[PDB]
Design a protein around this ligand. Structure first.
Ligand SMILES: Nc1nc2c(ncn2[C@@H]2O[C@H](COP(=O)(O)OP(=O)(O)O)[C@@H](O)[C@H]2O)c(=O)[nH]1
Ligand code: ALF
Ligand SMILES: [Mg+2]
Length: 359
């Protein structure tokens, strides 16, 4: 193997895995809302990564055949699993020092100096990645991925941080925003680019499937709920859906009394990750804790735009019976659908969770 120097290299002297994923996402993904925030179905996307590891130049990514979210996941996993972060562990002191200078122009010039000390393959790979993220955020009116969000999603794999690394998020954000300057992009490329009872609740589920909005519309938070005569102080613990936070998420699990396990009705992949990812993790850290399987964004089930996007990959919104079958398959206490956006079903979600916690 997973070393940067051991990879099959493109004509451009960067790893083919990086070149191929970035090219595909650039062609077919710059409009996808939540690109790089949403993830693919675990087993399917890990197969694609394994193909790239076996023989990267043999993988031909084709629209309609490969999921954008599998490819974005593959790119992040590539950087996360390098023996050494592409930014170099040995230069992390200089990165941090650069990040603490007072004025942005001074930080950019220092970042430029650090990048200059990297090995050639690292520099060219980092340049290609940052230029890609620069293009992504320029399309944020469509994909909703501003520079700050991309930096939060990419800093853990790029720098190989624990998951909370504050200096590295600033660097990445400023590298993206300052891409043209830091990487000496000439004016021709600039033009070409222009074209009494207390109970603990934890919520888990795929990135962007609506966990935080569900906690917010109802309300670490606290909600006071009354069910069956009993007044309950429900402690709400929010968690991140991305793989990058897998090491930090178990901090939230101790003492949990009920789990909200979420998928989005507009994402069959997020339902498929219920048995593949969330159920094994939750049953390992929260044995014998009741699970409410929650289908979020119910308002999108018959939404025309949603139905058209999923049909491109021969998918359709999750049906109520599919969620119920899944709830039975994993041994959930119950199944419930809701829309944080319209508030429909939100009370029923937390009332069922509270009854589960009290049984
Ligand atoms: N249509 C619709 N969109 C939603 C709903 N809930 C959340 N969203 C959107 O989905 C995106 C991610 O939501 P968020 O709760 O932050 O996702 P989280 O990553 O799981 O915490 C945001 O753009 C929300 O506005 C919903 O019930 N209906
Ligand atoms: F993508 Al999230 F909480 F913002 F899982
Ligand atoms: Mg969230």
């Amino acid at each position: 193997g997973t070393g940067l120097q051991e990879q099959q290299m493109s004509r451009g002297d960067i790893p083919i895995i990086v070149d191929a994923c970035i090219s595909f996402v650039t062609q077919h993904g710059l409009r996808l809302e939540g690109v790089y925030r949403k993830g693919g179905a675990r087993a399917r996307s890990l197969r694609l990564l394994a193909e790239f590891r076996r023989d990267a130049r043999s993988v031909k990514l084709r629209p309609g055949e490969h999921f954008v979210e599998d490819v974005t996941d593959t790119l992040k996993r590539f950087f996360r699993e390098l023996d050494d972060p592409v930014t170099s562990a040995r230069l992390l002191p200089r990165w941090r020092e650069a990040a603490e200078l007072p004025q942005k122009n001074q930080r950019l010039e220092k970042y430029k100096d650090v990048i200059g000390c990297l090995p050639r393959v690292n520099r060219r790979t980092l340049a290609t990645l940052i230029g890609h993220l620069y293009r992504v955020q320029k399309c944020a009116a469509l994909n909703q991925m501003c520079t700050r969000n991309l930096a939060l999603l990419f800093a853990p794999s790029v720098f190989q941080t624990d998951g909370r690394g504050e200096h590295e998020v600033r660097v990445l954000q400023e590298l993206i925003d300052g891409y043209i300057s830091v990487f000496d992009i000439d004016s021709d490329q600039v033009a070409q680019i222009d074209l009494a009872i207390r109970k603990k609740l934890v919520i888990v589920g795929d990135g962007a499937c609506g966990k935080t909005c569900l906690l917010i519309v109802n309300s670490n938070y606290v909600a006071d709920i009354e069910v069956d005569g009993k007044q309950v102080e429900l402690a709400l613990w929010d968690t991140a859906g991305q793989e990058d936070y897998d090491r930090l998420r178990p901090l939230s699990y101790p003492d949990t009394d009920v789990i909200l396990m979420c998928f989005s009705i507009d994402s069959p992949d997020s339902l498929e990750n219920i048995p593949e990812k969330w159920t094994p993790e939750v049953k390992h850290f929260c044995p014998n804790v009741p699970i409410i399987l929650v289908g979020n964004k119910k308002d999108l089930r018959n939404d025309e735009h949603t139905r058209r996007e999923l049909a491109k990959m021969k998918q359709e919104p999750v049906k109520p019976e599919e969620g119920r079958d899944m709830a039975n398959r994993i041994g959930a206490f119950g199944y419930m659908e809701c829309s944080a956006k319209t508030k429909d079903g939100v009370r029923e979600v937390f009332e069922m969770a509270t009854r589960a916690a009290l049984q």
